[PDB]
Ligand binder design. Sequence first.
Ligand code: BZB
Length: 358
Amino acid sequence: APQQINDIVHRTITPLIEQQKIPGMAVAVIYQGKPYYFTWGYADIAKKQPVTQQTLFELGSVSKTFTGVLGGDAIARGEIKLSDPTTKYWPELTAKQWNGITLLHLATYTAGGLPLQVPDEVKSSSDLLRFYQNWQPAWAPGTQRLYANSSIGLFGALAVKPSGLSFEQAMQTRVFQPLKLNHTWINVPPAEEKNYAWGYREGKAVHVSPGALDAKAYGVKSTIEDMARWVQSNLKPLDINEKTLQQGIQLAQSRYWQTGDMYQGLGWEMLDWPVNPDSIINGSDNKIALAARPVKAITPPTPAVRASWVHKTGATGGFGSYVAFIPEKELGIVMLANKNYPNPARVDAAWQILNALQ
Ligand SMILES: OB(O)c1cc2ccccc2s1
């Protein structure tokens, strides 16, 4: 890589790793649209397996960006509309509190206080129907944003219904494959197990716990090379050959709601560029990021703004991930770690790097 990229990455990420005691890390910097890769440490401590360009990391909630884009793609295909009632695609969801709750609300966490987590006891299809049928809202739809797996997870599940495909097969065939994300999986196949990093929590090797809607809300595993391609695809959507996917990526970066200085897309979150770094750093702390916030509708949504900081944090028990990019500058970063460390440290590091290079 150019010396300036190597310099800021080494001065920023290498000490971050020491500070946070991260066992293994992969970073990609996209600069003038071209990817550069950086690796540290071990994918598997016990086996002394190094992190490589081939190492799969758990993306955690960075998966929500794939769900958002898949949903965007279904819209572009004319299969779903965000204005449609949730009940249009789940006719058995008949309970009165769902009247007025649309796919937009599910996708953007604005249904009125759907919970962060589906309770662990909720497993089967019948359990899931019961949970949503019994759920009572904290607020009217389209008034408050509460970041929630139960919200966007259900959006992902319903978005694929008209296609008839499973969520996994829609994602594979409509997003991963056209973008040549050849080492990106919702379910890691046996052939990839040797490349699947262990996560580390309290010094113990761990992989993500199964859950209802895991595939839709936090279930993607990917390599640093595939994630760099994901960034390139989101930096320059109108260069993707598949027309509905091009549009789907664009729709996921539309601004649907505003809270403070942030805007909610489909999976992606956005701020106007240039940003106050303290806003994104402090704003990424879970005490803010998981709190209810009042939203103003952007009526109608602003199409993807090139002058944006577009980003998403992700965590599982054993992994911490971050992706951020600025389409105007053809600039982006992916940080994948096999320890879950605080969000503000990730964002701070990403800001130092991208602000040096913009
Ligand atoms: O990485 B995300 O922001 C997630 C938040 C939660 C909360 C509970 C369970 C699983 C997840 S993934």
